[PDB]
């Protein structure tokens, strides 16, 4: 790996610089290098890994959706034949996106998840596994699509089980996991009722626990609760 000669601490330092410069591909490459040093990641380091890849894959997903919409329009009645270029370029972006997802899933499998014993790390990594299988599902059309969807589901479900046993209902990781698994139900698994029920129950159980929190923890939890409410408003 091209980061093999750089110190772990230097990679983390540069990831933070790359974030300030909005250089998210660099940030992700630095964090990949840091993971590949083989040591477990701290809370802050897990967040840097997450932010870097979220921004890279989020840009790819946005571009894929633009291209897929153009491709869909090209296939409607009365549309002039424009050649293979739209499909080719959508496939190019799709393949790069799949490559990023495969890289993240590879880091999680070698060996972040198996060494993650505390709920805050294990839930975080299993949520990420669900998320990156969800991004693969968004673009999947082949024989393995059901298995990709089920891989996302399985990862989310393991994270949910741990989070409900080991974290308070206001924990931001627990909340963000529920938010994203609810989106999985709505957008991937054709299960809008499950999506709505999960978001509502998560929101209500968090509300009931806010009284236990400091002002700063309250801010953290209510920020994610508002996202749950935003989705419920969208869906009802």
């Amino acid at each position: 790996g091209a980061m093999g000669s750089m110190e772990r601490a230097s990679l983390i330092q540069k990831a933070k610089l790359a974030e300030q410069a909005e250089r998210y591909e660099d940030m992700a490459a630095f964090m990949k290098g840091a993971v590949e040093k083989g040591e477990e990641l701290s809370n802050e380091e897990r967040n840097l890994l997450c932010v870097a890849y979220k921004n890279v894959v989020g840009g790819q997903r946005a571009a894929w959706r633009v291209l897929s919409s153009i491709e869909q329009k090209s296939n409607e009645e009365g549309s002039e034949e424009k050649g293979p270029e739209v499909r080719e370029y959508r496939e190019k972006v799709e393949t790069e996106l799949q490559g990023v997802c495969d890289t993240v899933l590879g880091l999680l499998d070698s060996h972040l998840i198996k060494e993650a014993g505390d709920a805050e790390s294990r839930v975080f990594y299993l949520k990420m596994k669900g998320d990156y299988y969800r991004y693969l599902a968004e673009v999947a059309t082949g024989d393995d699509k059901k298995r990709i969807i089920d891989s996302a589901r399985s990862a989310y479900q393991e994270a949910m089980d741990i989070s409900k046993k080991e974290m308070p209902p206001t924990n931001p990781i627990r909340l963000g996991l529920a938010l994203n698994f609810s989106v999985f139900h709505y957008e991937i698994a054709n299960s809008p009722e499950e999506a709505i029920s999960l978001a509502k129950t998560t929101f209500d159980e968090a509300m009931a626990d806010l009284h236990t929190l400091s002002e700063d923890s309250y801010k953290d939890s209510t920020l994610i609760m508002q996202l749950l409410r935003d989705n419920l408003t969208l869906w009802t």
Binding site: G176, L179, N180, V183, W235
Partner: peptide
């Protein structure tokens, strides 16, 4: 699109 984090 719905919100995710």
């Amino acid at each position: 699109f719905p919100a995710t984090v």
